[PDB]
Amino acid sequence: ATIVALKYPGGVVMAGDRRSTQGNMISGRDVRKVYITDDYTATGIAGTAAVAVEFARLYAVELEHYEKLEGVPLTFAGKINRLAIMVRGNLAAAMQGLLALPLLAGYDIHASDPQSAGRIVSFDAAGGWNIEEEGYQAVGSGSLFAKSSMKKLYSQVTDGDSGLRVAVEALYDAADDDSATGGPDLVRGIFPTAVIIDADGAVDVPESRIAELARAIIESRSG
Amino acid sequence: ATIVALKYPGGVVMAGDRRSTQGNMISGRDVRKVYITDDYTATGIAGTAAVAVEFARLYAVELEHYEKLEGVPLTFAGKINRLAIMVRGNLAAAMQGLLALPLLAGYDIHASDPQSAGRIVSFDAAGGWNIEEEGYQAVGSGSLFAKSSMKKLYSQVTDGDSGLRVAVEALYDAADDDSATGGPDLVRGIFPTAVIIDADGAVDVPESRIAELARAIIESRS
Amino acid sequence: ATIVALKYPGGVVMAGDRRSTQGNMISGRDVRKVYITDDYTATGIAGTAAVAVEFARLYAVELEHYEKLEGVPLTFAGKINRLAIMVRGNLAAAMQGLLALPLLAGYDIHASDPQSAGRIVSFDAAGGWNIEEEGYQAVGSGSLFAKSSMKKLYSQVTDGDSGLRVAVEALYDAADDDSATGGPDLVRGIFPTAVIIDADGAVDVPESRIAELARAIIESRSG
Amino acid sequence: ATIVALKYPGGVVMAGDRRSTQGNMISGRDVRKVYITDDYTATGIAGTAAVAVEFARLYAVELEHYEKLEGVPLTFAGKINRLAIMVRGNLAAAMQGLLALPLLAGYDIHASDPQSAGRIVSFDAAGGWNIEEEGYQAVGSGSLFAKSSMKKLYSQVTDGDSGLRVAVEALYDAADDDSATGGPDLVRGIFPTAVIIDADGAVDVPESRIAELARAIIESRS
Amino acid sequence: ATIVALKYPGGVVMAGDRRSTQGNMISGRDVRKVYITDDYTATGIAGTAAVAVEFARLYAVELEHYEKLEGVPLTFAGKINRLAIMVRGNLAAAMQGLLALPLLAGYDIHASDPQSAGRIVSFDAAGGWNIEEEGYQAVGSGSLFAKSSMKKLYSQVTDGDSGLRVAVEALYDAADDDSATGGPDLVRGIFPTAVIIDADGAVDVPESRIAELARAIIESRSGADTFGSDGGEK
Amino acid sequence: ATIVALKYPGGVVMAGDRRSTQGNMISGRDVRKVYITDDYTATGIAGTAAVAVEFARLYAVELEHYEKLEGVPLTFAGKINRLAIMVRGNLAAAMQGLLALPLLAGYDIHASDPQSAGRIVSFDAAGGWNIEEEGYQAVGSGSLFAKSSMKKLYSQVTDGDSGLRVAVEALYDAADDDSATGGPDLVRGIFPTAVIIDADGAVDVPESRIAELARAIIESRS
Amino acid sequence: ATIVALKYPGGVVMAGDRRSTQGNMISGRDVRKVYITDDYTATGIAGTAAVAVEFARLYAVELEHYEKLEGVPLTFAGKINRLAIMVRGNLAAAMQGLLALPLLAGYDIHASDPQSAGRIVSFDAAGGWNIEEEGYQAVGSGSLFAKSSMKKLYSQVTDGDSGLRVAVEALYDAADDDSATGGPDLVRGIFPTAVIIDADGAVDVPESRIAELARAIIESRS
Amino acid sequence: ATIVALKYPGGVVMAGDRRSTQGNMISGRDVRKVYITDDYTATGIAGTAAVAVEFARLYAVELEHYEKLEGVPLTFAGKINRLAIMVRGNLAAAMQGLLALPLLAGYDIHASDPQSAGRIVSFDAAGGWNIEEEGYQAVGSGSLFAKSSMKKLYSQVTDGDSGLRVAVEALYDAADDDSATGGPDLVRGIFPTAVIIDADGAVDVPESRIAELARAIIESRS
Amino acid sequence: ATIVALKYPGGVVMAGDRRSTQGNMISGRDVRKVYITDDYTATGIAGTAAVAVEFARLYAVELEHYEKLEGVPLTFAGKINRLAIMVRGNLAAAMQGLLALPLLAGYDIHASDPQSAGRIVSFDAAGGWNIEEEGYQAVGSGSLFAKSSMKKLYSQVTDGDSGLRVAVEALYDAADDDSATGGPDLVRGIFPTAVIIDADGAVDVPESRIAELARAIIESRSGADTFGSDGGEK
Known part of the structure; x- marks a missing residue:
């Protein structure tokens, strides 16, 4: 598994x-x-x-819960803290082999400058x-390679x-x-998923665009 | 790792x-x-x-050594035996995590019927x-999937x-x-290796043939 | 043990x-x-x-219980979630040896397209x-062989x-x-059990149908 | 595994x-x-x-070696002893999971009564x-079921x-x-192997006879 | 120990x-x-x-308890389930060496066909x-031999x-x-115990019948041992 | 197992x-x-x-070997010593579970009084x-019950x-x-084995006599 | 530690x-x-x-020793083999913690194309x-970062x-x-060491060149 | 990690x-x-x-909590005691590996002499x-080097x-x-953080002052 | 234990x-x-x-033995190698707790520049x-404090x-x-030992110079403590 995140203007x-x-065997192709x-x-x-899916579900439930009770969503620092308590609470089971590490990306509406309102935690x-x-x-497991590729590409x-x-490319390395x-499967048309967040909210990337970018990367490195 | 072998007429x-x-990390793309x-x-x-490359080297040396001393290659039975004795010799190190398992293909020149002189051990x-x-x-680690693929594909x-x-398809699965x-890497152009043995000896399949077969399979599945 | 499931139109x-x-000894022939x-x-x-029979019994009790209380059966996602909680709850005893893994097949009446309303979980x-x-x-134990045979046959x-x-054939491999x-016992006339689910519900397969298919497969490979 | 032996008149x-x-996985259909x-x-x-195939091979070699040196086979007692010593020698490896138990059938040519010169050890x-x-x-793993079957069938x-x-029936149970x-595989046509020893030596039972008996048993039980 | 059960028409x-x-020593001869x-x-x-005698007493108490409270005996499936819950309950102590495995035989009055109303669980x-x-x-410990003998005799x-x-004979092997x-002790006159269940209930077998059947099986195996040989050698 | 020995006049x-x-399973009915x-x-x-049958065989060989070399059997003391040295030699294997304990009965020809030349060791x-x-x-495992029986029956x-x-009765208890x-098997006709040593050497008691005594005991207890 | 090697035309x-x-403590600034x-x-x-310095010393001795005895250096294949055998010999001590891994760069004079006679092993x-x-x-411990750097920088x-x-940049990352x-210490003036091998042999890069390259990189990143 | 503290008049x-x-890998550069x-x-x-960030937050919450309830801040001795009870409370998890050691610097307004009102705990x-x-x-880990440098510089x-x-310099050694x-990173402009406490309260040090002092130290030692 | 070595021009x-x-107990005051x-x-x-005294003794024997056989001392490189091999040979006993680490100072007579022929290994x-x-x-156990002292004092x-x-000051710290x-014992008059090596060989520093050097250090520390304070407080 590998998850990359990066800020853009x-x-x-x-x-x-x-x-x-599941060990060496490939158990799933579209998680x-x-x-x-x-x-x-x-x-x-x-x-x-x-622990991954439970974390996502429980976290989303909690954020919207506080929003409904208080009529106002949490600040970003609150969101971070709640997630961190939820992770700390899974430390006992995590030492037993049920470890799940999250990676939180957000856009802070209350941030002073709109152009740097992105955050990565x-x-x-x-x-x-x-x-x-x-x-x-x-x-994730491939995190070091992905970080080392984004280190050379982040100037673009x-x-x-x-x-x-x-992002697609760092995932590729x-x-x-x-x-x-898993790399871009050209046979079954399975590609990485993406999410983009800005002043107008967080939207999922349509699969076709990630596919165009993917094929473009492969055509580029084949020669 | 996965190595298939099949007899044909x-x-x-x-x-x-x-x-x-090494663990989850891909260390060699062309072994x-x-x-x-x-x-x-x-x-x-x-x-x-x-242990693998060493076995292969030493076994080849031994076969050829007896051949030079006695003026005639061992029978396929003798070859089977010597390989088995090497494998038995690595047993302690195999339990220490240095396991190496060989699969031996051969063409018996002394067999009665040439059409079935192929041998897998x-x-x-x-x-x-x-x-x-x-x-x-x-x-190898993919052997069960390969065998379950060849069981169905073998009538062809x-x-x-x-x-x-x-063979190439079984590897693909x-x-x-x-x-x-590893499957066929279309980007770097690295394909499985293949050896064919028949009445005339053992030759390496040149890469182009394996490339065409792999591309036919890949187009067939998409 | 081996249990196969597959979607059909x-x-x-x-x-x-x-x-x-029970180890090497065959203890039962008609489970x-x-x-x-x-x-x-x-x-x-x-x-x-x-643990298997218990999961079956308890799960069925629970589904019908919610139906009687709420006057409406659960959605399919709910069913999945309840089963998963029930499996997670047996993790402690499962580490000690009492492991039971389920395989859920369903037909979603509320699904948009009736032809893809099958589900496998x-x-x-x-x-x-x-x-x-x-x-x-x-x-099950034979799961990898069965999956590898259904991989070559699913186009039929x-x-x-x-x-x-x-299905019967994959079970056969x-x-x-x-x-x-266990393979089709022709001597005692014991054959795999099957269940079929569609728009009209889930019905058990009559034994003579599975038996006829079985003898057909054995006769086919016998030469 | 299961190997039965019985004396007849x-x-x-x-x-x-x-x-x-290998565990729950069926690896050989014709050993x-x-x-x-x-x-x-x-x-x-x-x-x-x-360990099994090795025991058998080495024991045959030793029996025949003494026969060539001395010009006469060992008595059945000597054979029993050499086999026993070979078994005792594998005890260390057997405690480490390489156990092999032999069952020895023979026909004593020197016995007094020919009708009871059969021997099982x-x-x-x-x-x-x-x-x-x-x-x-x-x-073998099926030995208890085989013995409890022969106890009842042996008067026949x-x-x-x-x-x-x-013999074939005991194996079937x-x-x-x-x-x-493994039982008789009617699909692939693989049946138990059998050896008969009497006054004239040891001969392998040809497969057809074993196929017949297996089909008679299977028909009887349906 | 060995306990056999079999259905008859x-x-x-x-x-x-x-x-x-108690290990190798014989501690009791009439359990x-x-x-x-x-x-x-x-x-x-x-x-x-x-754990054996305790299970028996507790189970009987429970069945009759439900009968008195509800005015109607449990169905057979209920009986099975209660026994299984009891056995599952003794699993913790069973892993520490207090293991007891039961074997339930019954006759289902509510079963459709009277001739197959026998049940073995x-x-x-x-x-x-x-x-x-x-x-x-x-x-029991001798269960595999008993099962393998009943496999050849059940057609009678x-x-x-x-x-x-x-049943007596499978117990004998x-x-x-x-x-x-333990085999039939002819000296002290101790023989296996038997119970028979049918439409009219479950009754204990009188000891003389089991004893005559026993002596008959011994005379038959001794005469069949006299008739038999080892390939021709006695 | 249980082996009793008693001196008589x-x-x-x-x-x-x-x-x-082997555990709870009865494997040999006539050892x-x-x-x-x-x-x-x-x-x-x-x-x-x-280990038992080895001890017995090898000890017999050693006694007879010294007898052939020196032209005279060892004294009863020497025999006791050699047996003891064998037993001491098996001590490591005995701690590893392969324990064998011998009981040696002899008739000393050199003793002074013939009526008490019997020896048990x-x-x-x-x-x-x-x-x-x-x-x-x-x-053996029944030794305590056998001794406690002979203590009472020995005045006879x-x-x-x-x-x-x-002797037979002690075994029965x-x-x-x-x-x-195992006790006397009346169904198969298998009875304890017995050896008698006196001034004239060692002879095996023929089975019929042991059969008769066993029947006398059995009727006595019914 | 980190040691990179790359072929160039x-x-x-x-x-x-x-x-x-040693642990978190910096013990040598100029190894x-x-x-x-x-x-x-x-x-x-x-x-x-x-183990590292010893390997290097002993291997150099052995290469040169065979060269003096036979009057001709080993082929690159033989060198590879001897180094491999040394490494295999240290395996017992490597499990005890004394692990040393070599990376061998050479220029094959016997290769066919001079532009690709470079060799990394x-x-x-x-x-x-x-x-x-x-x-x-x-x-070395930084090898993954170094490789992921060279993958991108290698087209240059x-x-x-x-x-x-x-090379110097990969080390910097x-x-x-x-x-x-350790990176380039501008305060003490200690820079990575480098060796260049081509058709004319092996020479150490003089420190000044490495100093200039390092300063260029450092100013590029500011 | 390293944290130094020192009294000045x-x-x-x-x-x-x-x-x-995170072991050998540098995971953060601006903590x-x-x-x-x-x-x-x-x-x-x-x-x-x-455990570090949690301690900081929880401790600050507690101090201001008591201030709001009692309308008067704790004495300095109280602050010390509360922190110590918190540290003692983390002792179990600290033996499990989640160890955090604090270092408290304060200025006591209630102290008799204003010039020695600094405290280090x-x-x-x-x-x-x-x-x-x-x-x-x-x-911290580098604490001994920092202490040994401040031992030679504290007279200045x-x-x-x-x-x-x-302070900046001791951190540098x-x-x-x-x-x-971590040492002063001149490339990314990351330098140690500082806090200064006197009669007028505790204020953070502006970054440019620490950077000037840092560069002065590096020019001094080059 | 703590042993410092430093080159000078x-x-x-x-x-x-x-x-x-031995543990917390002071057993030898003049080793x-x-x-x-x-x-x-x-x-x-x-x-x-x-182990320490043995390395010392046997190493001296070996150096001098080769010198007598070959008529010329080893080069500084050979000496380094022999000492290293002796150390490597004690590795098993060092894992068993009998660890001894040597610090070797020498004056290379064959070096090019005499002013920098000093050697520490x-x-x-x-x-x-x-x-x-x-x-x-x-x-030794005080090596970190000694090094951190010499880093500052070395420009002198x-x-x-x-x-x-x-050297003496670094030991004092x-x-x-x-x-x-142990520091300088002014009561019993026991001071650190010192060897100095230059172009003319190796000689032991006689005790007097070490004694009055340590004395001067002690007076400087006392006076500097009287001058200083804890941020204003004494």
Whole structure:
């Protein structure tokens, strides 16, 4: 599994791959790992698939719950803290092998400058969170390759779109050197999922656009 | 890793993938796992890469050494025996996690019927061996998927070429359902390796043939 | 044990074998492993026989319970979720050896298109569930052989019937390479059980149909 | 695995099934577990496949080697002893999971009464042996079911043929109640193997006769 | 210990042996292991003798309790389920060495056909139960020999009585190859106990009938041993 | 297992049961556990069957070997010593579960009084030995019941026959209270084995006599 | 530690950092990890410092020893083999923690095309080796970051100097993302070490060139 | 990680570095480890990052809580005690691996002499606290190097500013010999954070001042 | 234990403390840990006392033995190698707790520049060695404090005497911050030992110079403590 996220001028993009494994065997080819938890935040979770889906569901329930009770959504710092408590609470079971690490991407409406209102937050096993200040991040098994490719490509990220391309590509190298990360399957037409967040909310990327970008990357590296 | 071998009317074919891993990390994109040990045998080895390449090398040396001393190659039975003794010798290291299992294909020149002189032989970690009769075998992490593919595809095998295509396809399915087995890389142009043995000896299938077969399969599935 | 399931145009078919073992010894020759839990679902369970029969019984009780209280049956997503909670709850005892993995087949009346209203859901030990999109699935010890045979035969599935044949046959190869899966016993006339689900509900397959298909497969491979 | 042996008036018969497993997985559909070690003995070996085939081979070599050096075969007692010593030598490896138990059938040419010159001998992992006196023996995972079947069927044994049928049936019940023992495969045509020893030596029962008896049994039970 | 049960046309017969051991030493020679838990069901239990007798008493108490409260006895399926819950309940202590496995025989009055109203139910350690439909079953240490003998004799079973004979005999072979199962003691006159269930209820078998059948089986095996040989050698 | 030995006026008698088990399962119905190692000593061995028969055989060989080299048998003291050294030699294997304990009965031709030249000697796993003075000994799982029986029945021992009957009875009670010891099987006709040693050497009691005594006991207890 | 090696048109370059740690503590600021084992091969070793320096020394001795005895250097294949055998020999100590992994760069004088006579070879702890064919390799704690850097920067490599700059940059990124790898120390003036091998042999890059390249990179990133 | 603190005439200065690691990999480059917990106390925490940030937040919440309830802030001794009870409370999880050690710097308004109203308090794992009476202190991995540098520089401390320089420098040597402590990154402009406390409260140090002092130290040592 | 070594313009100096402990108990007040192994080297050994004295003794024997056989001392490189092999040979016993680490100072007569012919060499438990370039080294429980002291004090080193004073001071700070290292005992008059090596060989510093150097250090620390304060408070 691999999930990359990167800031672009005016928003944030989070993309995740599609494969789920059981040891060496490929058990699944279309797992969606990026969820739109609310109008302005998307959450990608890596690890044990059970703890992953439960985290996404429970987190979304909680955010909308507080919104309905208080008539106003939480601030971004609150969202971070709630997620971190929920992660810390799974530390006991996580030491037993049910570890799930999230990766939170959001757009802060209350932020002073609209052009830097993107935020990327990465968590550990102990619920310690860090607000990323370096433009991108990745979690999962292939995370190191993805981070090392985005390190060379992040100078091209100039808007939402080129950011989407760099994300697809970093996912491509992650899959390229890590067998647990699936690469663009051209045969079944299965490609990574993406989410884009800006002033107007968080929307899912239509599959055709990720496919055009993917084929473009493969045509580029074949020669 | 996954290495398939199947008899066809008049010969034997043996093919292997190209990936080598360390855990989840893809470390080698072009390893060759099928060797031509002598003019009438080929040996695939699954498992620990060091122990594998070493087995292949040493076995080839031994076959050829006896051949030079006595002026005649061993019978297929003797070859089977020596390979089995090597495998039995690595047993302690195999339990220490250095396991290497060989799959031996050969063409018996002394067999009575030439159309069925093909030979496939499989080994376990304890050196016991078994001559295969159902016409195909495989070894490695993808072996079960490969065997279950060849069981259905094997009625199509009628000559050297059809047998080659069936081999390549079985590999494609192994790789399709197991992450430790690499499929045809169309981007870098790396394809499985194949050896064909018949009445005239053992030759390596040149890459182009395997490329065309792989492209035919890939178009057939999409 | 082995339980296969596959979608066909207009419904779903689930078939399971008949043998139960205690180590190497054959202890039972007529265990039924596929149950009709409600008018539109069928549950097949593999593993510890006790935990299996309990899951079937308890699950059916629960579904009908909610129906009586609320005057309306659960949606399909609800059914999946309740089963998954019930599986997750058996994780503690499952680590100690009492492992039971279910396989849920259903027909969704509320689904938009009637021709794809079949559904197949597979579970793990941690209660993570996956909605299957490949058209078939199998659980049990012989599951990998059965999956690999249905992979080559699924192009012949065109209705409830050809689907039934492919199911019986995949079960036949599972039994053929796995000693824990029983093959068609021609001597005692014991054959796999099957359930078929479509717009009109879930009905058990009469035994003579499965027997005739079975003898047809054996006669076909005998030469 | 399961190998039965029974004495009939005038000779001995020894039959064995054909399956070989790895856990729940059926790996071999046609293994031969009963060898003719010499003109008047036959050896079945249950257990680890490697250790089994090796035992059989080496024992045959040793019997014949002494025969060539001294110009006369050992007595049945000497053969029993050498087999026992070979078994005792594998005890260390058997405790490490490489156990192999042999069942030895023979026809003593030096015995006084020809009608009871048949001999059956069973061994444990610790090399001790025992000469059977109840007319039959078996070894392997199905041995208890086979013995409990022969206890009832043995009054029907009156010659070479009835003894052969009782052997095949005992195997059928072993396989019927135990999954590690293969029964007659009517689809692929694979049947138990059988060896008959009498005053004239040891001969392999040709497959057709075993096929007949198997079909008679299967018809009787339906 | 060994307990065999088998269906016969119109009823069911359950027979059990008489010995109890403490390791190799024979500690008891007249343990009764087959109980009549109610008018139509008999229960035989094997394993730790404590957990055995306790199970029998507790089960009988429970069945009659429900009968008195509800004015109607449980159905047969209910009986099975309660027994299984009890067995499952003893799983924790069973893993520490207090294992007891039961074997339930009954006659279902509410069953459609009176001639197949016999039922045999076998349990495991996890309380999973199986309704037997092969005609017979056995539990205990000698269970495999007894099952393998009843497999060759079950074609002679035609009524309550011939079924009783086959039961005594299967018990005889169980005891014959398993030292933990006691054979008919001709010296002290101790023989297996039997229970027979049919349309008229479950009754204990009088000891003289089991004893005559026993002596008959011994005279027949001794005469069949005299007739037989080892390939021609006696 | 259970092997009793008792002195009587003028000789010694040694008897043993016939059962051999594997756990709760009865595996051998006619094992012979009492051997005649030489013209004046018999040896019983309880425990692991293999180690038992080995001890017996090898000890007989050693006694007779020294006899052929030196032209005179060892004294009873020397025999005791050699047996003790063998037993001490098996100590490591005994701690690893392969324990075999011998009970040695002999008739000392060199003793002063012929009426008390009988000799019984018992051994532990550590090779120490002890010359028995209370007139009887036993070994095996039933030894305690057998000794507690002979303590009461021993005043009846007045010659070779009465001593034989007391032996058979002691065995009967061992078997009566312990399941690993077989009693007289009236159905198959298998009875304990017995050896009698006196001034004229060691002879095997023929089976018929042991049969008659066993029947006398059995009717006595009904 | 981190040692990168990359082929360029006509030669090979091999560079290594300078830090050596004990836990979190920086213990050596100027270790040299890349040796010139002979006129056409350089060897880097990651891992335990003792085992590393010893490997390098002994291997150089052995190459040169055979050269003096036979009057001709081994082929690149023989060199690969000897290094592999040394590595396989240290395996027992590598499991105990004294692991040392070598990366071997050489220029084959006997290769057919001079422009691609460069050679890079990588080893695992079990002595198996692999001839790298994607143009670059690395070893040590920073190896993954270094490889992921060279994958992107490698299209810029066109000669000896550009290849050298790419090497230094890859090292800079290794150090940038891993704390056990030292970067260019501008304060003390300590820079990575580099060796260049081409048709004319192996020469150490003089420090000034590496200093200028490092300063260019550092100013580029500010 | 490393956090230094030192008294200067009229106040106290606490400075901490910026790097966070995950084993050998550098995971963070701008972690702030010094917090202003209230108008007159700053708290620096080292160890597990989670336990660190949690401690800071919880401690600040608690101090202001008591202030709001009682209308008067705690005395300094109270603050120390509460922090120590919190640290003691984390002792179980701290033995499990989630260890966080704090370092408390304050200015006591109620102290008699305004010029020595600074205080430095260091804690252990068991919540035992000590009031330092030696002018300075440091916690973290690089703590010993920082303490040993401040030991040679503390005679230059004469006001808030020279104290700030000595702090930055001691942090520089800590980072210089400890890979887990980050040095001044001149490329990204990341420098240690500082807090200064005196009669007028606790204020954060503007970044440009720390950068000027840092570059001054580097130019000085080049 | 703590042994420091530092190069100065034209030579090398090597000093060591005198304490030897067992747990918290001070067992030896006058151990000598720095030996003159030959006319141009000196060896300090930290760690287990037995193993330490043995490395020293046997190494001196080996150096001198080869010198007598071949008529010329080994080069500094050969000496380094032999010491390293001896260290590598003790690795098993060091894993068993009998660890001894040597620090080797020497004056290379064959070096090109006499002003920088001094040599300091440090070893780990696995026999690897390293030639120190930053001008000073130390070994033992107080080594970290000693090094962190010499890093600051090293710009003051200009000759043999100043280098000696810096050595003694570094030892004083090691002892000041670690309890296993003994400082100058003014009561019993026991001071660290020192060896100095230059172009003319290796000689032991006579006790007087060490005594009054340590005395001066102590008075400087006392006076500087009287001048200073804790942010204003004494």
